[PDB]
Amino acid sequence: MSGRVGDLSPRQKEALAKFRENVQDVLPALPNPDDYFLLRWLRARSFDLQKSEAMLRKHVEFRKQKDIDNIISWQPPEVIQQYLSGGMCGYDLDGCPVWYDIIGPLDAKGLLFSASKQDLLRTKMRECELLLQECAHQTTKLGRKVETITIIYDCEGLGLKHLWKPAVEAYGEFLCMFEENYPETLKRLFVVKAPKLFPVAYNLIKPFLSEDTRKKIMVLGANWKEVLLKHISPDQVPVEYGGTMTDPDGNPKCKSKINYGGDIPRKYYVRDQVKQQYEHSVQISRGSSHQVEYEILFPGCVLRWQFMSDGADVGFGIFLKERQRAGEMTEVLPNQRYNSHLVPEDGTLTCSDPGIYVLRFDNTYSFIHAKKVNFTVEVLLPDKASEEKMKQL
Numbered sequence: 001m002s003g004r005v006g007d008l009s010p011r012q013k014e015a016l017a018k019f020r021e022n023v024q025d026v027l028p029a030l031p032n033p034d035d036y037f038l039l040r041w042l043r044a045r046s047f048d049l050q051k052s053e054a055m056l057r058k059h060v061e062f063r064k065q066k067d068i069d070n071i072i073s074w075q076p077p078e079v080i081q082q083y084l085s086g087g088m089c090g091y092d093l094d095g096c097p098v099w100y101d102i103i104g105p106l107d108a109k110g111l112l113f114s115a116s117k118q119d120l121l122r123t124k125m126r127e128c129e130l131l132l133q134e135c136a137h138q139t140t141k142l143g144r145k146v147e148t149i150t151i152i153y154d155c156e157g158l159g160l161k162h163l164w165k166p167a168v169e170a171y172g173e174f175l176c177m178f179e180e181n182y183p184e185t186l187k188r189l190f191v192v193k194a195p196k197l198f199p200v201a202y203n204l205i206k207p208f209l210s211e212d213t214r215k216k217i218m219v220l221g222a223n224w225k226e227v228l229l230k231h232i233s234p235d236q237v238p239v240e241y242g243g244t245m246t247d248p249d250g251n252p253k254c255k256s257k258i259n260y261g262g263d264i265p266r267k268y269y270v271r272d273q274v275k276q277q278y279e280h281s282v283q284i285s286r287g288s289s290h291q292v293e294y295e296i297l298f299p300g301c302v303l304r305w306q307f308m309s310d311g312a313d314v315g316f317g318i319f320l321k322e323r324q325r326a327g328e329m330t331e332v333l334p335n336q337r338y339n340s341h342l343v344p345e346d347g348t349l350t351c352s353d354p355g356i357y358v359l360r361f362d363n364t365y366s367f368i369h370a371k372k373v374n375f376t377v378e379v380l381l382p383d384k385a386s387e388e389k390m391k392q393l
């Protein structure tokens with residue numbers, strides 16, 4: 001059996017009936033606690049009554065604290081409405097709403113510098129409620145239950161700038177929220193136009209995804225447009241993605257439904273940086289330097305770092321190798337001075353050649369003494385399975 005309405009084993013039916021009795025006290029506060037609704041929670045925890053109940057009660061508490069009942073009427077900040085990419089557009093062959101995620105032109109720094117992380121997360125919650133509401137409308141129009149969504153995840157333009165830690169963490173917060181509050185809602189997710197950086201980028205959010213979500217992700221190759229047309233009718237897919245749908249004015253991208261992001265104009269900023277902490281701190285003497293070592297053995301790794309200096313700029317460069325002078329080592333990222341005391345510095349480097357990498361903070365050119373440098377560095381690894389897919393497609 002599949003644990004779905006109309007296909008329950010006697011044990012699952014008994015569990016469903018018991019589950020309803022056990023959570024009776026919170027059902028009135030729910031929009032429509034039918035059997036489909038309850039079974040999403042049971043399936044998400046393999047019909048373990050205790051875990052399923054804990055999951056649903058936590059969701060109920062979440063709805064209360066986030067005022068989900070009124071979130072659709074809540075209007076997100078102007079900068080978010082204008083620049084947060086993505087959009088609901090069309091229905092798949094089964095009648096399920098399709099959601100488009102446009103990663104490339106998303107300006108995470110711009111959004112985080114112009115709005116609170118709370119409003120960003122709330123906007124995402126709202127999109128989820130808008131999608132569920134669309135499912136409810138499709139259920140009425142099609143005369144049958146529609147409760148899942150199809151996602152087209154456009155990774156064209158995915159680059160190193162998207163690995164910026166604060167953005168990834170915020171996104172991770174959304175994903176955990178989605179996994180805990182909208183179980184059994186994702187039907188299928190098509191990753192299209194995934195670039196070379198995909199395996200590393202995916203490995204960053206993979207920890208936030210449930211096994212059920214991971215199994216629904218399909219990384220598509222060169223024939224992605226044809227694959228989409230096997231699940232979605234051509235008139236329901238924008239011209240931009242291989243279909244025939246366009247905006248009334250003839251735009252192939254259907255911008256009336258899909259937001260394509262873009263960099264946020266400086267006039268919207270309310271800050272030039274987000275609050276930041278570092279895992280390490282060193283005091284560098286005048287005319288001296290400090291070396292930080294990381295062994296990179298696996299190819300395809302990416303070094304990601306963030307650092308700030310106190311009161312004065314500092315030099316920074318990355319080398320490949322015991323304490324050697326910069327000149328004795330191989331220069332991978334040319335040493336340069338950064339005003340990391342004015343604006344926090346962050347960066348990434350793709351590590352092609354394995355070896356011992358040395359990030360070197362340089363103060364050899366200065367008399368300013370005891371410069372305090374705060375930094376955080378990580379070696380980002382590629383998701384093995386994803387690496388293999390990139391070789392196939």
Ligand SMILES: CCCCCCCCCCCCCCCC(=O)O
Nearest residue numbers: 108153162163167168171201202205
């Ligand atoms: C419903 C959401 C499912 C999640 C699907 C994730 C598919 C892989 C996404 C990799 C994204 C790369 C990281 C981008 C981080 C950012 O937003 O800046």
